Design a protein around this ligand. Sequence first.
Ligand SMILES: O=C(O)c1c(CN2C(=O)Cc3cc(Cl)ccc32)ccc2c1OCCO2
Ligand SMILES: O=C(O)c1c(CN2C(=O)Cc3cc(Cl)ccc32)ccc2c1OCCO2
Ligand SMILES: O=C(O)c1c(CN2C(=O)Cc3cc(Cl)ccc32)ccc2c1OCCO2
Ligand SMILES: O=C(O)c1c(CN2C(=O)Cc3cc(Cl)ccc32)ccc2c1OCCO2
Ligand SMILES: O=C(O)c1c(CN2C(=O)Cc3cc(Cl)ccc32)ccc2c1OCCO2
Ligand SMILES: O=C(O)c1c(CN2C(=O)Cc3cc(Cl)ccc32)ccc2c1OCCO2
Lengths: 149, 149
Amino acid sequence: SPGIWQLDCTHLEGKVILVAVHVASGYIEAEVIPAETGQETAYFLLKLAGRWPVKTVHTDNGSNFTSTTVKAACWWAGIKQEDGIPYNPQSQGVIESMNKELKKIIGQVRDQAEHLKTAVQMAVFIHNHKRKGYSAGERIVDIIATDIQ
Amino acid sequence: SPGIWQLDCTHLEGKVILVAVHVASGYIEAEVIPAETGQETAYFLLKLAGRWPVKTVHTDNGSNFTSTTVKAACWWAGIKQEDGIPYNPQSQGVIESMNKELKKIIGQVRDQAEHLKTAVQMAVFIHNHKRKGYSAGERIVDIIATDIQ
Ligand SMILES: O=C(O)c1c(CN2C(=O)Cc3cc(Cl)ccc32)ccc2c1OCCO2
Ligand SMILES: O=C(O)c1c(CN2C(=O)Cc3cc(Cl)ccc32)ccc2c1OCCO2
Ligand SMILES: O=C(O)c1c(CN2C(=O)Cc3cc(Cl)ccc32)ccc2c1OCCO2
Ligand SMILES: O=C(O)c1c(CN2C(=O)Cc3cc(Cl)ccc32)ccc2c1OCCO2
Ligand SMILES: O=C(O)c1c(CN2C(=O)Cc3cc(Cl)ccc32)ccc2c1OCCO2
Ligand SMILES: O=C(O)c1c(CN2C(=O)Cc3cc(Cl)ccc32)ccc2c1OCCO2
């Protein structure tokens, strides 16, 4: 459980926002890229796995799942690469709802920055700090620290 | 002390590596930028503070300490911006030692990537996972989680 993350890709202003969600807490990291390519996904995962203990990643689509660059990064980083098929058929709805909420947050800060990438990082900040009550950031630290503490 | 971070800026291959260290654990995040400007430092801090609970940052120099773009990001993110003067005079050697170690790691992976930014993120991964027997990544989550609970 504490090592599991889900990748998610969404589009806004003709750019791509790649998101990784820590499935047990709802904590996220996100970046703006020009387009989702295996190389960008690989580098996003290498960043993520240097910062948090990423044991398993459910990939967002079959292109990333197949990408040899992605598989090379997963190998390098000790990550088990898995599919992101909604085996629980409520996973597709959860992912859609997350993107809608993320885009709502982005719209709430959009005017405070020139560049979309800045507004996305403001939106990561607001989501991870939001109380609902613990925040996502509190939950992920409690989850991982319990895992041997 | 669980919210305290130190910024640090080092140079390699004619590029700038900006580093934030979590003082109590030694955990780091790092990025490659063309040059240290207020805008890049501000954006780096906004990313950091969306991901970890950053209460105080000791800035790496007086230009960032003065930068109104940095001060605006610190206000936005709820960060107390402080100087990074080694009032504890060993603090100078500790920072240069960290840079030399980081550049050693980078040299150990440099050949496995075309682009410096990828080698820096590999180095972040290796440092944060290194056992010294707990890792930096383990220490920071234990520090912050003990603070929550
Ligand atoms: O409120 C949401 O819908 C939301 C969520 C909801 N969420 C959880 O709490 C757990 C979880 C697992 C997965 Cl697989 C996807 C989303 C979520 C996560 C991230 C977000 C969200 O909203 C916007 C920004 O990021
Ligand atoms: O206008 C922008 O998008 C931008 C900004 C804009 N801006 C400021 O000038 C002060 C500030 C605080 C915060 Cl919390 C967010 C954005 C900004 C800062 C750094 C950047 C930016 O672009 C991307 C890289 O660095
Ligand atoms: O402030 C939060 O909601 C938060 C927290 C909350 N919190 C803790 O549980 C421990 C802690 C220490 C400090 Cl000194 C400030 C806030 C927190 C932890 C990690 C985060 C957070 O938000 C950013 C993502 O990581
Ligand atoms: O071994 C080191 O010197 C080292 C350190 C040492 N370190 C700690 O453990 C605590 C600490 C506080 C501060 Cl203010 C600076 C460095 C460190 C941190 C990060 C690194 C390091 O080397 C590799 C890259 O990151
Ligand atoms: O050659 C690079 O530096 C690079 C790479 C190189 N590379 C692979 O092709 C597979 C791989 C695994 C890992 Cl663990 C690190 C780098 C690479 C991937 C993504 C990138 C890169 O550069 C920019 C960001 O995206
Ligand atoms: O693997 C580590 O050394 C590590 C850890 C170590 N560890 C824990 O304390 C709990 C845990 C759960 C899992 Cl499932 C894997 C590793 C760890 C935590 C955070 C990190 C780590 O390294 C990456 C940065 O964040």
